[PDB]
Amino acid sequence: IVEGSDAEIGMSPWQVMLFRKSPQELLCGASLISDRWVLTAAHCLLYPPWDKNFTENDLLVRIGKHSRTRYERNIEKISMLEKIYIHPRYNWRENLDRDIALMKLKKPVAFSDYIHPVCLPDRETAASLLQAGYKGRVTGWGNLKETGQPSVLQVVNLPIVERPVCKDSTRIRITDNMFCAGYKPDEGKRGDSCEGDSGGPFVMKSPFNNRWYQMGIVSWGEGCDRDGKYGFYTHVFRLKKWIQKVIDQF
């Protein structure tokens, strides 16, 4: 996260760290959506251009964390993966269209003050809140600048951007399964996701029911926090039919 701040304790209790077993290292962010299901970006798990093709046994998830590097004894929980599910139409070849994946945990995780699931949006909450100028929040342990790494989880609040501005900022083909967020060059505030924040949640707090909803997944950007560029996020509601199908079937 670039130009963010340190998270408060328990501020993002759905935040998940995807952790490589060997070598032991951070791989991505992710989010807790129930006691046994974790949501992330598909490119955290499968990205052939970079020879990335992780299997269940390569990975752990670490839930309840705040410090990036510490083992947070009596606070964090570490879970093994039963199964990975990648969207069947995830487009790793071109533009990261449908950049979404689910991971089922081997055993349910116990909720706590530090571990709690986020909501997924219904159609109406999505329609009400996914509007240009409305702000969401991104959290992660990724890099603090494009060209370095945080002691603790970082947080940044960013406005959703008008779709023509998103389109006109990039040469990538953008789709309805994406939205972009960030400040414009003239606005006097900045911030972005960056490398290592991939797969983490873009959340919004509904003013109707005072609950947090995950609207986006950290997906792609050109550099980090560049003027005139924006971060792009997987549109969780647009892909919710697939999420529901996987959870119901598996």
Partner: peptide, 11 residues
Amino acid sequence: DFEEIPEEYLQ
């Protein structure tokens, strides 16, 4: 750079 996690999780 990361503190070693407990061996039980690497079984």
